[PDB]
Amino acid sequence: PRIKKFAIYRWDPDKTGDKPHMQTYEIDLNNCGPMVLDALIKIKNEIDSTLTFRRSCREGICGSCAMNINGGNTLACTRRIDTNLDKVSKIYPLPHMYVIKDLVPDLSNFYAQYKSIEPYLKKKDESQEGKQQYLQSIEEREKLDGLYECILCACCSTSCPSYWWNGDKYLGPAVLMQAYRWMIDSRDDFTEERLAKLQDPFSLYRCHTIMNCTGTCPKGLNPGKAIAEIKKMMATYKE
Amino acid sequence: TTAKEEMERFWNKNLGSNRPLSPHITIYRWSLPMAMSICHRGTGIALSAGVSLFGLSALLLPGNFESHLELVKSLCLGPTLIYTAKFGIVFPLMYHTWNGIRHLIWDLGKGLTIPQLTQSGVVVLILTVLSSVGLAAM
Amino acid sequence: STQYPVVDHEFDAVVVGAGGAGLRAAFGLSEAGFNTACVTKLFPTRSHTVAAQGGINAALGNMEEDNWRWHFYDTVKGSDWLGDQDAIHYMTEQAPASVVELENYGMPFSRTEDGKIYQRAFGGQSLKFGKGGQAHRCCCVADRTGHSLLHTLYGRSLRYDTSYFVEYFALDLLMENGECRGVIALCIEDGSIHRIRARNTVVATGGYGRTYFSCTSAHTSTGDGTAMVTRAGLPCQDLEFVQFHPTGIYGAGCLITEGCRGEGGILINSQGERFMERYAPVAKDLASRDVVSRSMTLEIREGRGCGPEKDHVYLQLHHLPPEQLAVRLPGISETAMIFAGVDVTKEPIPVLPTVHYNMGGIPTNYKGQVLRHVNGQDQVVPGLYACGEAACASVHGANRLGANSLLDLVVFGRACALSIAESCRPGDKVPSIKPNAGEESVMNLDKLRFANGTIRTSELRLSMQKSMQSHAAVFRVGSVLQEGCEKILRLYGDLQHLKTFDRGMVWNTDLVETLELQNLMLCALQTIYGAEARKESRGAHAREDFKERVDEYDYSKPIQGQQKKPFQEHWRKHTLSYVDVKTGKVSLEYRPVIDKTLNEADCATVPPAIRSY
């Protein structure tokens, strides 16, 4: 027998006077899977079904189980429970976000920011598209590596204080990285006007190289490297 | 629906409801590269306040600089105490100097990976101690 | 009633599904000039099509010179001649056109020296109609193809005025006198019920993989739209045919793609023998989805399993160059390290055949139109469409060919859009729904909300998943299927004995998973009853009692002086299953397979042959 203590954030919007409070659960690790999501599923299925959370692929590629585990915003199906029984695992929602119900954050603003950068290929002549494949060299494709793999789980954006204090105006690492993901793409012709979209102090220049985004990424991506690479392009671009 | 209309309806819903904000500074784990960012502001703001106090006093308060130095000698110049007085000025200055270069290296794009952040962070933290103690004994 | 707020929405078309097929059908209609609504319980990115790792099939001719008609033969031979050849024609011809389109949309495909889309070998594909060795037409985005597919499809979909009902659990189809009027849905955000009505409705809810215990599919792959069609008195096609992907992690059940067996991956058992070369002569571990997994599970029966339990097999990725593994298979490189805890370059990966794909679903034309079955004849249901995994156009037939589902997504998603585009205009009268309609959907919601039963929701789900895993596995006996049928039958009666603790409106995951449980059962009953009824070994469905290929003729000898068998005597026909919602009795009819192509001159009809690689 190996019981593990879990401290989970709980709030019920369907009850009047209910304040944010922590709830404790005990689970045998021998009956449970290795990952945190396995335990979240286990208490949902066995102990308390009142727990409400996002889950889907349990593979680490959909980005549903995005939450704060022990002071770190990572995927619950990617990160495993600490076998050390002395430590109690603290499970929280994504930092500085409007809680809908139990670890489920409102990402309506996050998704809307991703729409504003226009994450689709834009050609000058779209009359000849849909009939032939565009040519891209092996080196030009290597520039997209470490950028396209973004799951949009919103772990990096919800980790930096600049997205905490300036959530409305500042886009955040996840959104800015994807703007850069379409910049270096040799097929895109709108590179100049994509940079001209960030010519306000809040949208891009609200980053101060705090480096909390890249430290918490589940996929091991570096948004900060991309963000600083945007600043270089913004400083030196034609017209 | 458009791109900015979703952002408008985001704030018009949450602020008109009783939804709580998920904890941010209360729960997140303290890391060195992140803690050094706070101290860069901590030094920055206080160090700019030192210059602001130096300029405003020179403009508003009467008397020359040489007469003000004799006013400090009224405390009878404690050898170990005056060392600590000058140390508390070079420490915020030299921390912001070495870490300021690190930010300029980041602007070029060099060394933005997690291991290189901690490596260059300790370099700055150690250089801070050496330049603070070294320039205090002059 | 007074508790639930009903909100009516007026649109030209409704597409249930935000993944690949549904997503392509959604903005495809918006591009045509339709006011399209997209009801989905997940966020478009959170959809499963993301979990796709292998690739997407197109005969572009980038590696070797290829023909789409050779891709036609591989899909029809793979389907074990249950596949509708009119659909296979339509898919393989639109194959290169749709991928070229996707590349222009923004999909960052892997590249070669020429600069063209990187294709590579995949499961059971050949050149020169099966005479020229192995075919290389599987277009990939380096082990993360479906992730890159869904993102660049969603990214492109922001360009058009599409109303996305994000996080809306669709309950039932709004039906009036045999015509689809729209969709009734539950908003997860506030707990309100919305009636999104339109002249046309597209269904792309995906497969029902969660019917089983061990599956590669996501938790949200519960086959809801199939149950919506089921509850409407409409038939479901070929539900007994369930795919078992050869390679997948022994633990959690996550997928290790067939991209491995194609780049140069080999399969090894307990002794160290290449066992797949013993079962397949000049095909090896590069054979069909069913044939590879058939051998793997048979090796366990002999006692030649691997591990401490000796119940799983091994995948050899040790000998492959580390330079290739990092570039061509980065997706499995990380996931095998996380779940299995196994190094991908210095250790072989543990694998086990697990549930992957559902060939069946909602009966479909080659255009995307949903088909009912009245008087032994095909009839089009007005205002209803289906595309993707949830649909059964039977372009995959008895056994789905490797990397064909993402093609099935884009082509038939496009077809669903063009069927509403070329027939019927935008702005046409939105057919009037009853002022009462949806009463049963609201009463079903209210019953499960205040549930005070004896069995917990998950405790009933566990009984379903373990029963399907043991009674309807890769090999299934009629003696085991008979017990499996009546076991699931009793569990359907227990759906009124269930307990729900969470009694709220805003985000009730205790309620929607119970609704998913209701939808899983309706898929589970038609799967098990259809499996015990079919008495043959065709594709995925293989019987121990009847291991024969029951066609119209015995194709081992040439047909010329041989006589034909009656329709109700041979099993080369589609299994159309109904189920009475209240009693839970499964009654099933049958319809003939489509053998004729769209054009005989342009693409030849492939007659049944000896299915073996």
Next chain:
Amino acid sequence: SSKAASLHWTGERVVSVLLLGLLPAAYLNPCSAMDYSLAAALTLHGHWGIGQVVTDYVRGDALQKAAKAGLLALSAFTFAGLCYFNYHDVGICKAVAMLWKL
């Protein structure tokens, strides 16, 4: 589209390498001309420094404009004070040297 936010960013980096280049220059070459160049760089960098702080924390349409106007007055008084300290008094290069050996 006019690029103003990008030029302001580079301007902050221009004074950053300028102020870093002046600290050893003031030690090695302490003169009257060095007093003003160090004062012009020290007040400008600080003004854009706290300027970044106001944009981060100070919320509102009325508050941010009031804080930016207050910071502009604070910076103007700081630069005018140092120039007065360089012209009529000792000068920061020689003034810090007197404080150093004390």
